Amino acid sequence: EETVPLKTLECYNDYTNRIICSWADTEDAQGLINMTLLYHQLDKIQSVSCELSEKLMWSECPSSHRCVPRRCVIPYTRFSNGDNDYYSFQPDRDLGIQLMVPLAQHVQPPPPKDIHISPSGDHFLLEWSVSLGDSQVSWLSSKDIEFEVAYKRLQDSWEDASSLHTSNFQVNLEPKLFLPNSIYAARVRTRLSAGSSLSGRPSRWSPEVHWDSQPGDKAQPQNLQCFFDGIQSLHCSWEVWTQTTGSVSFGLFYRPSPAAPEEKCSPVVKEPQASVYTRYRCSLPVPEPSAHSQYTVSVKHLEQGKFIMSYYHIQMEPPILQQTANAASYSLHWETQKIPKYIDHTFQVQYKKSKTENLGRVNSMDLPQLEPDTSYCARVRVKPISDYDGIWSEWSNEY
Amino acid sequence: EETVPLKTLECYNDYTNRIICSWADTEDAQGLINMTLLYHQLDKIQSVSCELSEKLMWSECPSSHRCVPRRCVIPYTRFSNGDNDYYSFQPDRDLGIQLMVPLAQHVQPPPPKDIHISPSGDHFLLEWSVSLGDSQVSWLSSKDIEFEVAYKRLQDSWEDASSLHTSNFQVNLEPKLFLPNSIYAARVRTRLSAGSSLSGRPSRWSPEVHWDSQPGDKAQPQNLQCFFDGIQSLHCSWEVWTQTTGSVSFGLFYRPSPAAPEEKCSPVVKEPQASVYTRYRCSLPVPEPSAHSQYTVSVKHLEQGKFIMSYYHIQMEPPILQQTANAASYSLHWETQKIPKYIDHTFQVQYKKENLGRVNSMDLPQLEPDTSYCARVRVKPISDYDGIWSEWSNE
Ligand SMILES: *[C@@H]1O[C@H](CO)[C@@H](O)[C@H](O)[C@H]1NC(C)=O
Numbered sequence: 001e002e003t004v005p006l007k008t009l010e011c012y013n014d015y016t017n018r019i020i021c022s023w024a025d026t027e028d029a030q031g032l033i034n035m036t037l038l039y040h041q042l043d044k045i046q047s048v049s050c051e052l053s054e055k056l057m058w059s060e061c062p063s064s065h066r067c068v069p070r071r072c073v074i075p076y077t078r079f080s081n082g083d084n085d086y087y088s089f090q091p092d093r094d095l096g097i098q099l100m101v102p103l104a105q106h107v108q109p110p111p112p113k114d115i116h117i118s119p120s121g122d123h124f125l126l127e128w129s130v131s132l133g134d135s136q137v138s139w140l141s142s143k144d145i146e147f148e149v150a151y152k153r154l155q156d157s158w159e160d161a162s163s164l165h166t167s168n169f170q171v172n173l174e175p176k177l178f179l180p181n182s183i184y185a186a187r188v189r190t191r192l193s194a195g196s197s198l199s200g201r202p203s204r205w206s207p208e209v210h211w212d213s214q215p216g217d218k219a220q221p222q223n224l225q226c227f228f229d230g231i232q233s234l235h236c237s238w239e240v241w242t243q244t245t246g247s248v249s250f251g252l253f254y255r256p257s258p259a260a261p262e263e264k265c266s267p268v269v270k271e272p273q274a275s276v277y278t279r280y281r282c283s284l285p286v287p288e289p290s291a292h293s294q295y296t297v298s299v300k301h302l303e304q305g306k307f308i309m310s311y312y313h314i315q316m317e318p319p320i321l322q323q324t325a326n327a328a329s330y331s332l333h334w335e336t337q338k339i340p341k342y343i344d345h346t347f348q349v350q351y352k353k354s355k356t357e358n359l360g361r362v363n364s365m366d367l368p369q370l371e372p373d374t375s376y377c378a379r380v381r382v383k384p385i386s387d388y389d390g391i392w393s394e395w396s397n398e399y
Numbered sequence: 400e401e402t403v404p405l406k407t408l409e410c411y412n413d414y415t416n417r418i419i420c421s422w423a424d425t426e427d428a429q430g431l432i433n434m435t436l437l438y439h440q441l442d443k444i445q446s447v448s449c450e451l452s453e454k455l456m457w458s459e460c461p462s463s464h465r466c467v468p469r470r471c472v473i474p475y476t477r478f479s480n481g482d483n484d485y486y487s488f489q490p491d492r493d494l495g496i497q498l499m500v501p502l503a504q505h506v507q508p509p510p511p512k513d514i515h516i517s518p519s520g521d522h523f524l525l526e527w528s529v530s531l532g533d534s535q536v537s538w539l540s541s542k543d544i545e546f547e548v549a550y551k552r553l554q555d556s557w558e559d560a561s562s563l564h565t566s567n568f569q570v571n572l573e574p575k576l577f578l579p580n581s582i583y584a585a586r587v588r589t590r591l592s593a594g595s596s597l598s599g600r601p602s603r604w605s606p607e608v609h610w611d612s613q614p615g616d617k618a619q620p621q622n623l624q625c626f627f628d629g630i631q632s633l634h635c636s637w638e639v640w641t642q643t644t645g646s647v648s649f650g651l652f653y654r655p656s657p658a659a660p661e662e663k664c665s666p667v668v669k670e671p672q673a674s675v676y677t678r679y680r681c682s683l684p685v686p687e688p689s690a691h692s693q694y695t696v697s698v699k700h701l702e703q704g705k706f707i708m709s710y711y712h713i714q715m716e717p718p719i720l721q722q723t724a725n726a727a728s729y730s731l732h733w734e735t736q737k738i739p740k741y742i743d744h745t746f747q748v749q750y751k752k753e754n755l756g757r758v759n760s761m762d763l764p765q766l767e768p769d770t771s772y773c774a775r776v777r778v779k780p781i782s783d784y785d786g787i788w789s790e791w792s793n794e
């Protein structure tokens with residue numbers, strides 16, 4: 001803990017009259033403060049007139065710093081064997097600071113600790129402990145002490161968070177104080193009674209405690225918060241559970257007064273977001289704020305749909321197959337039909353053992369020849385065409 | 400942004416009797432919400448009955464998602480060229496949310512902005528603006544608005560920060576609201592005057608803005624503060640300018656009542672701490688605190704110095720020479736005198752790169768090649784008195 005100039009001191013007597021001393025100060029520090037040397041002989045005080053060499057005569061500056069050299073001579077007409085020398089350092093300007101601290105108005109109580117989060121039931125049990133030692137009466141007790149607990153959900157900063165005050169050493173937390181599907185954090189600090197004489201800083205913030213809020217519907221949007229900027233705009237925000245947003249789309253509808261036609265807010269903005277909840281905000285103009293105006297705002301699901309008509313057609317059909325080679329096997333026939341009656345067909349056939357041909361709307365088609373192996377295989381389909389559209393029917397019977 | 404069921408919906412038809420449709424919901428959603436499919440016709444609406452499919456018949460799943468297909472059939476005998484087929488998805492539950500907001504009581508004023516940090520010679524000016532609109536009567540103007548500024552040192556957390564309340568669009572920040580050479584930050588928000596009928600939330604914070612406070616001694620330590628933990632202890636903390644600790648040590652002292660003798664509080668603990676400052680802390684005890692007990696705490700410079708006496712000495716010690724190279728080569732003379740006379744002397748001569756007595760002359764064996772030079776000596780005390788070996792002489 002030794003200061004620089006004192007370690008850099010060696011002072012050696014020349015024995016005629018004088019004493020010569022060599023010391024140093026740091027080279028960043030000479031700018032901030034200068035030092036004067038004190039020579040102590042019985043009662044004298046006596047500040048030493050100092051000068052600065054280019055190098056420490058008798059010592060080495062600590063190599064971390066680089067040093068500033070000093071060379072001082074103290075003329076001493078007479079020594080003795082009993083002369084007694086002490087060299088001390090002090091600053092040339094009297095610096096230091098002093099504070100009056102009335103104990104009453106400077107009390108900062110001890111923090112709470114041993115802090116446990118437990119559910120007992122529908123409720124949530126926040127507990128803490130505080131060490132006042134003893135005596136039971138020493139300067140503070142159950143009075144004048146009180147407590148402040150702050151809870152918030154993780155994504156929130158503490159700066160804005162709700163707060164409770166109990167003289168009790170535990171507080172019961174129930175929902176409606178909480179947004180269902182999120183992680184919450186709580187911490188306690190010890191506060192002085194507003195209702196007491198004693199003044200000062202609140203206790204250190206306790207360590208945090210984390211827990212998951214009661215479960216919730218998850219499909220439903222939550223956190224509907226709408227606020228008015230006092231000039232012709234109202235800003236509403238809400239949260240939906242992220243996994244829902246593929247299933248449902250939401251939008252925000254307002255009516256001024258519970259009379260006016262419902263009106264749709266745009267735009268709706270999507271906060272990015274990686275969180276388990278996804279936040280949404282929309283700002284709606286409010287052009288004629290009445291004195292007492294009650295806007296009524298709701299989050300309803302947007303509409304999702306399409307026209308399919310038809311124009312869209314599938315069906316399906318069987319051939320009857322009366323042979324496999326080694327004989328005269330003529331044509332093929334398709335039974336059902338499922339008879340459409342309005343609209344054209346363009347039936348399709350295939351054969352052998354990817355080999356096909358295109359056809360008209362004909363209840364049967366003729367085969368050129370096969371011979372060895374077996375008449376097999378041949379399959380059919382039907383695709384509505386011309387006026388009407390659709391998709392090929394699933395394949396039939398055989399292979 | 401269209402839901403995965405609307406993307407995945409393909410209804411296709413077999414004109415005889417029924418229609419069949421294929422669609423999906425997100426994998427994730429499966430535990431969460433049951434969607435239903437609606438067949439829109441004319442007057443009817445009529446929710447489709449659907450069941451779960453192994454695969455999506457006519458559609459690929461949306462590129463991002465993975466999905467869970469449904470297959471739905473509907474018994475429709477009657478058709479037409481004019482027929483209008485519309486299918487729409489909706490959750491089966493009534494799920495949705497409705498909130499009334501009387502404007503008067505939920506108001507979040509426009510935040511401060513275009514905020515400037517302004518120094519004067521002595522004071523500190525703090526500027527901003529607020530956009531309040533027109534007509535000059537809209538619902539709030541000079542009132543029901545108020546203000547709150549927080550300022551803190553760059554190193555502090557805003558959680559603990561000093562706050563101020565004005566009705567005005569600027570403030571003059573007295574120094575002595577501010578520690579000396581150091582860097583402060585500040586922000587402002589708009590609030591509602593207590594007098595207001597309007598209720599709401601204080602506005603968002605204006606942006607932070609940064610400046611460095613009045614210059615100061617800097618050799619002096621600032622920011623002494625002490626707290627009484629209400630049982631038997633008082634905790635103090637102070638800063639110094641870090642590169643001062645090379646020149647000076649400080650310590651913490653206390654007087655319970657001024658009349659009382661100064662005690663030195665120990666140990667003094669130093670925080671590292673990364674900055675231009677270095678923070679120190681020390682906690683000192685208490686007696687029974689008197690109800691009004693007044694304590695006095697000071698940081699002074701700790702005593703710094705070391706003893707010498709003599710018991711330390713140094714000197715210089717000339718020889719004269721008889722000659723060099725081939726005339727008389729033995730002994731040497733010493734001078735000066737320079738008379739200590741109280742103490743042992745033990746001068747020492749060397750040619751070799753030899754401890755001698757209080758004697759002022761040495762003799763040597765010699766050689767007589769070459770030339771005698773160079774020959775050195777030294778002067779010091781042993782026994783009762785002591786010092787550093789003197790510098791060699793004239794050689
Ligand atoms: C040290 O002394 C010189 C003149 O003797 C002066 O210019 C300088 O400012 C002093 N240093 C400090 C830190 O005051």
Ligand SMILES: *[C@@H]1O[C@H](CO)[C@@H](O)[C@H](O)[C@H]1NC(C)=O
Pocket residue numbers: 433
């Ligand atoms: C709605 O979803 C639940 C999920 O638990 C499912 O069991 C139920 O069958 C669905 N509703 C109907 C009417 O099938």
